[PDB]
Amino acid sequence: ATQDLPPISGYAPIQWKRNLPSRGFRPVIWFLGLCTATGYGFYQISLA
Amino acid sequence: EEPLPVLRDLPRPEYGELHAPVYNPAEKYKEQIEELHKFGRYIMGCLPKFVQQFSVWKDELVIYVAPSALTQVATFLKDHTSAQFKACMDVTAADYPTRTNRFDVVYNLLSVRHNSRIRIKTYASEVSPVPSVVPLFQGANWFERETYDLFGIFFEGHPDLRRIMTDYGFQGHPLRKDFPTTGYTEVRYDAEKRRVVYEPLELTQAWRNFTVGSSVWEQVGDGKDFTPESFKLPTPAPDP
Amino acid sequence: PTLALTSGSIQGTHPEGFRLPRPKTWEESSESALSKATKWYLLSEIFRGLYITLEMYFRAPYTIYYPFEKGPVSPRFRGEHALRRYPSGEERCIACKLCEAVCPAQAITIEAEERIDGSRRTYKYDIDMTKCIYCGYCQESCPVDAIVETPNVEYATETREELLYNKEKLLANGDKWEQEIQYALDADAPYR
Amino acid sequence: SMMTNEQVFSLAVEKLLNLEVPERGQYIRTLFGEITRVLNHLMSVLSHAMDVGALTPFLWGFEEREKLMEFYERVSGARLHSAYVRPGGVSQDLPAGLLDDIYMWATQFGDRLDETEELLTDSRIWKQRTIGIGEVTAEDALNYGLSGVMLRGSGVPFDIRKSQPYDAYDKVDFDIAVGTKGDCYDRYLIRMTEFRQSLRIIEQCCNQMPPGPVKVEDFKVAPPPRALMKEDMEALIHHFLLYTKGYAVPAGETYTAIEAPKGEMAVYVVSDGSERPYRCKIRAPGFAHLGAFDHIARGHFLPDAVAIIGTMDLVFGEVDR
Amino acid sequence: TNPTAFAQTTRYVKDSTEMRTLVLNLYRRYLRHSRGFVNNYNLDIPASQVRTKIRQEFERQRFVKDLPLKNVLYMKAQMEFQELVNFWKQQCHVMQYFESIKGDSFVQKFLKGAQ
Amino acid sequence: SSSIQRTLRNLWKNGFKKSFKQLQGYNDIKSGRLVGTDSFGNKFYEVDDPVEIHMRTRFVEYTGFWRQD
Amino acid sequence: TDLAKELVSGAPKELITERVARIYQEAKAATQSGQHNTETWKIDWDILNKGNRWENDLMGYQSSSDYMQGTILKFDTREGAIRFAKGQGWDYYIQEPKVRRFVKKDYSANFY
Amino acid sequence: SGGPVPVFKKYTTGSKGIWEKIRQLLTLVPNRSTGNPLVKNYRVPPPGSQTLKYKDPVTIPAGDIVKNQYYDRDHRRNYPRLVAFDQTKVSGLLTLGSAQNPRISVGEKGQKELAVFDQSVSLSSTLATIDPKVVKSELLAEGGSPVVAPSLNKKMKFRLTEESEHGMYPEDYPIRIFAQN
Amino acid sequence: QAQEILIKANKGNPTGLTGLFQHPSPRPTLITLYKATLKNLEEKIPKESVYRTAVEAFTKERLSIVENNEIIEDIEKKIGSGLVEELIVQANEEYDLIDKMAEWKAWEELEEKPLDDQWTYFGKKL
Amino acid sequence: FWPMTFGLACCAVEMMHVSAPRYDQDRLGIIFRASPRQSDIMIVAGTVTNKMAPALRQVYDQMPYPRWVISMGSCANGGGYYHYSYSVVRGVDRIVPVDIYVPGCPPTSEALMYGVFQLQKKMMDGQTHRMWYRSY
Ligand SMILES: CCCCCCCCCCCC(=O)OC[C@H](COP(=O)(O)OCC[N+](C)(C)C)OC(=O)CCCCCCCCCCC
Ligand SMILES: CCCCCCCCCCCC(=O)OC[C@H](COP(=O)(O)OCC[N+](C)(C)C)OC(=O)CCCCCCCCCCC
Ligand SMILES: CCCCCCCCCCCC(=O)OC[C@H](COP(=O)(O)OCC[N+](C)(C)C)OC(=O)CCCCCCCCCCC
Ligand code: SF4
Ligand code: SF4
Ligand code: SF4
Numbered sequence A: 001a002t003q004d005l006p007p008i009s010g011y012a013p014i015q016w017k018r019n020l021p022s023r024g025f026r027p028v029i030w031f032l033g034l035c036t037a038t039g040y041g042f043y044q045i046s047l048a
Numbered sequence B: 001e002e003p004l005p006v007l008r009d010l011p012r013p014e015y016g017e018l019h020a021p022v023y024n025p026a027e028k029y030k031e032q033i034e035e036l037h038k039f040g041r042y043i044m045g046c047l048p049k050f051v052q053q054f055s056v057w058k059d060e061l062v063i064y065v066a067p068s069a070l071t072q073v074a075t076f077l078k079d080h081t082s083a084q085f086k087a088c089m090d091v092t093a094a095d096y097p098t099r100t101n102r103f104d105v106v107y108n109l110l111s112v113r114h115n116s117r118i119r120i121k122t123y124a125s126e127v128s129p130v131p132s133v134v135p136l137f138q139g140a141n142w143f144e145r146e147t148y149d150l151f152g153i154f155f156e157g158h159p160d161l162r163r164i165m166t167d168y169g170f171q172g173h174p175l176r177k178d179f180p181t182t183g184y185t186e187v188r189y190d191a192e193k194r195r196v197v198y199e200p201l202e203l204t205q206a207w208r209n210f211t212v213g214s215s216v217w218e219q220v221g222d223g224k225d226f227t228p229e230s231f232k233l234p235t236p237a238p239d240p
Numbered sequence C: 001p002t003l004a005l006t007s008g009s010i011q012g013t014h015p016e017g018f019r020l021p022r023p024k025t026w027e028e029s030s031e032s033a034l035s036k037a038t039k040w041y042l043l044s045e046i047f048r049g050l051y052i053t054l055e056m057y058f059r060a061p062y063t064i065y066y067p068f069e070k071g072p073v074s075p076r077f078r079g080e081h082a083l084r085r086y087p088s089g090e091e092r093c094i095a096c097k098l099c100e101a102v103c104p105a106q107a108i109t110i111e112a113e114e115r116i117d118g119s120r121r122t123y124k125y126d127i128d129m130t131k132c133i134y135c136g137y138c139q140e141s142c143p144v145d146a147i148v149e150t151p152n153v154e155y156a157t158e159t160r161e162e163l164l165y166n167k168e169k170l171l172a173n174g175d176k177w178e179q180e181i182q183y184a185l186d187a188d189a190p191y192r
Numbered sequence D: 001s002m003m004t005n006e007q008v009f010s011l012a013v014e015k016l017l018n019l020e021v022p023e024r025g026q027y028i029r030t031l032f033g034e035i036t037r038v039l040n041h042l043m044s045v046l047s048h049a050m051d052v053g054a055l056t057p058f059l060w061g062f063e064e065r066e067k068l069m070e071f072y073e074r075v076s077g078a079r080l081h082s083a084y085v086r087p088g089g090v091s092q093d094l095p096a097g098l099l100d101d102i103y104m105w106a107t108q109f110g111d112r113l114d115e116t117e118e119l120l121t122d123s124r125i126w127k128q129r130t131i132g133i134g135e136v137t138a139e140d141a142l143n144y145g146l147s148g149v150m151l152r153g154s155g156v157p158f159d160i161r162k163s164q165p166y167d168a169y170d171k172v173d174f175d176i177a178v179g180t181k182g183d184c185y186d187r188y189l190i191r192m193t194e195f196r197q198s199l200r201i202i203e204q205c206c207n208q209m210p211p212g213p214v215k216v217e218d219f220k221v222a223p224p225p226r227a228l229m230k231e232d233m234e235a236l237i238h239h240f241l242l243y244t245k246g247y248a249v250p251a252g253e254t255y256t257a258i259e260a261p262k263g264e265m266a267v268y269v270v271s272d273g274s275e276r277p278y279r280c281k282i283r284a285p286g287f288a289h290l291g292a293f294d295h296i297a298r299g300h301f302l303p304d305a306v307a308i309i310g311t312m313d314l315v316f317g318e319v320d321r
Numbered sequence E: 001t002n003p004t005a006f007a008q009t010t011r012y013v014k015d016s017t018e019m020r021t022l023v024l025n026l027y028r029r030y031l032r033h034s035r036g037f038v039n040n041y042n043l044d045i046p047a048s049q050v051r052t053k054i055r056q057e058f059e060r061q062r063f064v065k066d067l068p069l070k071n072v073l074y075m076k077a078q079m080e081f082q083e084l085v086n087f088w089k090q091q092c093h094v095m096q097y098f099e100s101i102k103g104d105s106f107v108q109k110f111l112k113g114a115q
Numbered sequence F: 001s002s003s004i005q006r007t008l009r010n011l012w013k014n015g016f017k018k019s020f021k022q023l024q025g026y027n028d029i030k031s032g033r034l035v036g037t038d039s040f041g042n043k044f045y046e047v048d049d050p051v052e053i054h055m056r057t058r059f060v061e062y063t064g065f066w067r068q069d
Numbered sequence G: 001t002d003l004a005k006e007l008v009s010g011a012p013k014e015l016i017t018e019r020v021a022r023i024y025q026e027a028k029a030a031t032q033s034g035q036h037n038t039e040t041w042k043i044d045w046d047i048l049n050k051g052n053r054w055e056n057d058l059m060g061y062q063s064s065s066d067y068m069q070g071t072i073l074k075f076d077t078r079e080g081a082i083r084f085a086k087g088q089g090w091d092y093y094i095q096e097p098k099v100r101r102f103v104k105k106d107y108s109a110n111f112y
Numbered sequence H: 001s002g003g004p005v006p007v008f009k010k011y012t013t014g015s016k017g018i019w020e021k022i023r024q025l026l027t028l029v030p031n032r033s034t035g036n037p038l039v040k041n042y043r044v045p046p047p048g049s050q051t052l053k054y055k056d057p058v059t060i061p062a063g064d065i066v067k068n069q070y071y072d073r074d075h076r077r078n079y080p081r082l083v084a085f086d087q088t089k090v091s092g093l094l095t096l097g098s099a100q101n102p103r104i105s106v107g108e109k110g111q112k113e114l115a116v117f118d119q120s121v122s123l124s125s126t127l128a129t130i131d132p133k134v135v136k137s138e139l140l141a142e143g144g145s146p147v148v149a150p151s152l153n154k155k156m157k158f159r160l161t162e163e164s165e166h167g168m169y170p171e172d173y174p175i176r177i178f179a180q181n
Numbered sequence I: 001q002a003q004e005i006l007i008k009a010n011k012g013n014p015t016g017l018t019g020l021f022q023h024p025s026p027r028p029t030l031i032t033l034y035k036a037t038l039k040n041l042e043e044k045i046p047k048e049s050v051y052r053t054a055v056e057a058f059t060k061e062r063l064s065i066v067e068n069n070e071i072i073e074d075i076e077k078k079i080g081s082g083l084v085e086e087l088i089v090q091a092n093e094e095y096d097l098i099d100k101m102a103e104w105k106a107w108e109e110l111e112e113k114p115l116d117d118q119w120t121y122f123g124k125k126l
Numbered sequence J: 001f002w003p004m005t006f007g008l009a010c011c012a013v014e015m016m017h018v019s020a021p022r023y024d025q026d027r028l029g030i031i032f033r034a035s036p037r038q039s040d041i042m043i044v045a046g047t048v049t050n051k052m053a054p055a056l057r058q059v060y061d062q063m064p065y066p067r068w069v070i071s072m073g074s075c076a077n078g079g080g081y082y083h084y085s086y087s088v089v090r091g092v093d094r095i096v097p098v099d100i101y102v103p104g105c106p107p108t109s110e111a112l113m114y115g116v117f118q119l120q121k122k123m124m125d126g127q128t129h130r131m132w133y134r135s136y
Helices: A025-048 B025-045 B067-079 B140-151 C033-041 C044-056 C097-103 C137-141 C165-178 C178-188 D002-017 D023-052 D058-074 D099-120 D124-130 D138-143 D184-209 D233-244 D284-290 D292-299 D302-312 E015-033 E034-043 E049-061 E067-085 E093-098 E105-112 F004-014 F017-028 G080-086 H020-024 H089-097 H107-116 H123-128 H132-139 I026-046 I052-067 I073-080 I084-104 J011-018 J051-061 J073-078 J107-122 J130-136
Strands: B049-058 B058-067 B087-092 B103-111 B116-125 B185-190 B195-200 C078-084 C110-116 C120-128 C148-152 D177-178 D256-259 D263-272 D279-284 F034-038 F043-046 F057-062 G019-025 G042-046 G073-074 G093-095 H084-085 H175-179 J041-044 J068-072 J101-104
Touching: A025 C033, B025 B058, B025 B067, B025 H084, B025 H089, B025 H123, B025 H132, B025 I052, B049 B067, B049 H089, B058 B067, B058 F017, B067 B116, B067 D177, B067 I084, B087 B140, B087 D263, B087 D279, B103 B140, B103 D263, B140 D284, B195 E093, B195 J051, C033 C044, C044 D099, C044 D124, C097 C110, C097 C137, C097 D233, C120 C165, C137 C148, C137 D233, C148 C178, C165 J107, C178 D023, D002 D023, D002 D256, D002 D263, D023 D058, D023 D099, D023 D124, D023 D184, D023 D302, D023 E015, D023 J041, D023 J068, D058 D099, D058 J011, D099 D184, D124 D184, D124 D302, D184 H175, D263 H020, D263 J073, D279 D284, D284 D302, D292 D302, E015 E034, E015 E067, E015 I084, E015 J130, E034 E049, E034 E093, E049 E093, E093 J051, F004 F017, F017 F057, G019 G080, G073 G080, G073 J068, G080 G093, G093 H123, H084 H089, H089 H107, H089 H123, H089 H132, H123 J101, H132 I052, I026 I073, I026 I084, I052 I073, I052 I084, J011 J068, J011 J073, J011 J107, J041 J073, J068 J073, J068 J107, J101 J107
Parallel strands: B058 B116, G019 G093, J041 J068, J068 J101
Antiparallel strands: B049 B058, B049 H084, B087 B103, B103 B116, B185 B195, C078 C148, C110 C120, D177 H175, D256 D263, D263 D279, F034 F043, F043 F057, G019 G042, G042 G073
16 A cells, blocks of 8 residues: 555465475385396396 | 556555554563563572572562572473573673672573573673573573673683683783773784784774763653552551 | 462473484494495485586576676665755755764764855855764755765775865765665655 | 664663554564564574585575665665664654565475575585584573574573564464474574574565554654744754753663573663763673584584574674664 | 683682782792793793792782782782793784883973973 | 587687687677677676576676776 | 772773773753753763864865773762772762752742 | 475476476476566566665654644653662661552651661661561562572463474484474 | 481473473472471471462462372462473472572561662752 | 685674685685685774684784785774773774775675675786886
């Protein structure tokens, strides 16, 4: 009006709680992937 | 996925003429005034040998004690369950040269227990020592170190009292009223001596004292009476 | 009846659940041994920490290329001082000495007398720009808006003598920055 | 923490003056009491991390500081030393469109805290530098007068915005976080919570902002508006005497404490019925913290001292007032 | 919390004789460290003058009678020692302490403005 | 605002000599609508590019080449 | 009181030997009719016979080497001022304020 | 509440088209804003080019031309007077009661009693010689109970929340979030 | 007599406050110190002192609540002064005070009255 | 242009903001160094007290040539708000030679960069080696 005021219906709510969703596969799957790479790697070393 | 609103253009409330009640801000402390008065008297009754007097202002209770009554009253207010002031927030002083003991040492205690603050006032002169509360409150080690630096108060029982703020070998205690605001000396780099040297004070523009043009009329009245009606001596009513 | 009977208060009473439970032992960890060791040996959170930092590498930076661009300024900004004029050309200051008395740092020196034609004007007016705290009190106290702070900030000087603005210097600033002072005065007039 | 500094002098003087700020003024001092709190922790938490080694989280936050200092300059005219809060209220009213900028910054700022908590909260190197470092017991904290976060890290749930609510802090709803281990990692978590509680108050002050005067409607303690000054005789008299003689404060004394971002900051102002304070002792939280440094650093290594200084938030202007 | 090096408790003495023993004891402590004062502060004068000027300042207060004045001058007596030992003062301060230096006739002071 | 496309479009709009000067003092290759020239001779542009960041939508072209004040 | 308290104040010796203080009560100003600034006793120091004020050559300031030029003390009793001056060992001199003589003033006196 | 908010609902610059789909496929948390403010929204009418004509706000009772006498709202001169209670006045209040609960005779007999406590009366003696009911009724509280330190905030209480409510760190992290209750 | 009690455990489950461990025997320890304080109060502090009446007011009250409340959580909410481990230190300090309170003889006449000009600020009596 | 991190008080906060992302002093080759040996610019950002004064001279003497000193803000320039204090040096140019004075309380980040830009223009005007050929 003649002052700095919020709108009639107010402002929309904002995000202020923690937002850190975890990412990546389960820890077991990464270990399976590691022992697959190790097994395949020594297969190719043993082949050569 | 609607486009974001332009918050500049959204409608704003319309108001006509605004109304705000006018009432004395000191009224809202009324309940706090009585309870501090009761608890202030309680300490005096428990320790009549030490508490010279107590005073209440709005939501602040002050206990006035002698220097020889300090350790006793401080200990009582720290250990008594009804008043557990484990935390000492401030140790300071003030200079009133007109009084015989100029320095007025003030302690602020915090009770995280009951959510209260109490104030201890104890006087001191230039040469008379004051008991140190460091054996009770470890947080007063530096607050006492600062008060001596700026007021020269002798604190008896302090494990290590020394300058904390002013330079080493600084002459005079700055916050004493007789000490000029610009001090006595100043430093500069002397080419001959290859070192920074002290010289007597000499201002290129002398300080201007505009404080002389203070008010010649008294500006605030005698005040108002806000003592609880349970702490005034009753008037003996006239006879028939 | 209050809890003064036991020397207790509402404030001293802790909320429900305040006492901590029994800390878990090594047999109450939900993670299996291998899961806890795969995260430990393969640096689970560190590789995530790198990945979040690498997201910023593909974002627009914040840097602006000063002096070819300038950060935002507002009409209330306090900068270099300037003495203003009326449109007719007469100096705005009537040597009232208000600004000298507000000035927290005592940076202003005013010497005044009756002008040659009778006007109440000042013949000496200095600001010790190395003593001013750029606080805006002189500007607020001037009854005729004679002393203002222009939005200028780029006036660093080689010698300190050049930072003792005398009345000639401040009036030369008021002429130089008159257009920009009007920009700020027009915008922020009603708020004062 | 520039504006909270001048809020504790305003509260003390208004307390001595028996005056109360109008409703809108109190919301502005809460709005900029939390913008200032966000400004402080961005400086404190992120420079603490910089000492520990994390250089990048410093830089990300300091662009938020640039965005927040713009609000300082838009209302007062100075980025840092805004003499905005004064005894009786604030200097000027908010400029048009400031609320819509505090909001637009507030919508995004939540993600800026997450990207800070990404690099530090779960980092094993960060937790090795802080967990078990600088431990403080509740008995020791109360004895040395440790306040603010270096008392709620030790487990004590005390906060001055609750013990003595001031300037619209009683109207908004917000939580506090209390530690349990009294170490640097607990104080790190509490500060990161105080970020999100500030962003929770800041939104409410954007929605509950009332209209009306920002300062006491008492021209004998607040300067009259310039337009009224140049047209009304009594305004000119009061404008004259306020800027030369000052205003008299009734005699007495006070001790006003606020929950400063560093801790409990308080002033002991003694009045004499004159226009100049007779005494003004300033109780800086950092000064009481730095005394307890010897009692805490006893039994730690040189890389551990750097953490303890950062977890104390020692800005030495307050220590050496 | 523990006190720093060469620190002492602050006790207000109540006997005159007790103080002089403390006063005399403290004097050798100044004298004992005199060579180290020169070495640590790189003083340009031999340690003999350092011992020389220490003694003079003790005598300056010798004739105080009232007791409360005696303590404060002793409390500050210890503090100056403690700062000197621990290398707290800088070289500039100590040099200027020992680098200090007949009045003019009435005409001479009158000629140059006097005081 | 950092991609080489934004530098390519601005490089082509200005031409060589205008862009070479910005490659010498500005360190960035920008192009904008000319708004006016001041008494000293500097020219002030405004950037219409939708990708330019918040504080970089206005700039100057100083009169000199090796120095700017 | 009786003690030579100045030996603990750290003040320069010249305030005892070379300067003179004055204990006075400020007089009523002719311009204004208020009578409040004349109810507290004050201590001020005499100016110096040379070097109290001199014009700075560059900007025309008021340079000074007197470090007591802007030091005025306040009291509420005359004795406290004298006692405080005695304690510091100051070479003071007291200026007794003048006392206005009472004269009754009557509205009717303009004709009688 | 402070729940996560979709990125296109925040006032920051965001990608469009094929790059938006790339941005969502590769980012850890797709609703995280770049932080670069919207050029078309943020500060678009600068503080020096607004449209609002400001008007000085004035609440009616203190800004009115009528019913607005200054002595009604002159709070600076209605400050609470400073009263200090010495031992003597405590004794007088203790022996004679208060103004609300009088324990003093009337007329000249009462005026005799008040004058007794108009000069020094040490409180140590007063408690030694007075009815034990007086202490339980005046000095102490609730029948002899002590006087607990008064609270600056009678509404200061706390309660424990949990992550489903306070949204902060889960139960494993070593801090707890306290609400008001 | 030689009855040795534990005031602050140095090991055990935490209580939520740093440095304040859980007390192995909360209830018996409180009862021992409450009974000692009531006993030791009368040994040294006379009856006319209000302080003696004040301690016997609530040390009795805290002694009666402990007996009838075997559940620790019922003790805390009814005393209302924190955790039980804290109440031990309150009780202990309540005991130490009487040893010093008796020594100070703090029921007697004001040892040192202020001078006539002490609590006067700027020409007004406080 | 590697300065020395000699921030003392509130003037140092603006000094750090020059290095922040918005202004990014590093983009111009400015890296704050923590040692006189690796620094050639001394930036006095804050109040110079009497107790700090001898240390400031010692730190200044330890900088290898060529060296320049910038005075930032009102405290370093001429005392500023604390000009009439008993523990403040009224201008750091009473202790070290100052090559350029940046005015403000505190100077804005752009005001400090203008001071740095002004000094660089002066350093590019030096003729240290042509002086030998002509003046010597
Ligand atoms: C493949 C080669 C590149 C990556 C090499 C390193 C692998 C690290 C993850 C294994 C360790 C671990 O512990 O993995 C498991 C962990 C943690 O899972 P959680 O917290 O229990 O998940 C919670 C519950 N869920 C399973 C339902 C979600 O997942 C991660 O943190 C994944 C991190 C992915 C981002 C980092 C990769 C990109 C780095 C740079 C590549 C150029
Ligand atoms: C069998 C498969 C073999 C795999 C081999 C790989 C092992 C690597 C190390 C894992 C152990 C570990 O991270 O240990 C963490 C150690 C010591 O931790 P601690 O003192 O024991 O406490 C934690 C464990 N607790 C609680 C069980 C006792 O310190 C660290 O934070 C080291 C972090 C180094 C990070 C360097 C940056 C990485 C750069 C490369 C990627 C860009
Ligand atoms: C073993 C060591 C290997 C070499 C090391 C490299 C050093 C880096 C070079 C410094 C550059 C510099 O400083 O360029 C900028 C400086 C400073 O310009 P100014 O201060 O504005 O004054 C100069 C301008 N006036 C006087 C007109 C105001 O000169 C110049 O404008 C140079 C302008 C002409 C350049 C002609 C170059 C000819 C071609 C050379 C390549 C084919
Ligand atoms: S801005 Fe403030 S400090 Fe500077 S000249 Fe004006 S009143 Fe004085
Ligand atoms: S306030 Fe304005 S009119 Fe008065 S002396 Fe200062 S500049 Fe001149
Ligand atoms: S000049 Fe101003 S901003 Fe700089 S240090 Fe001094 S007071 Fe702080």
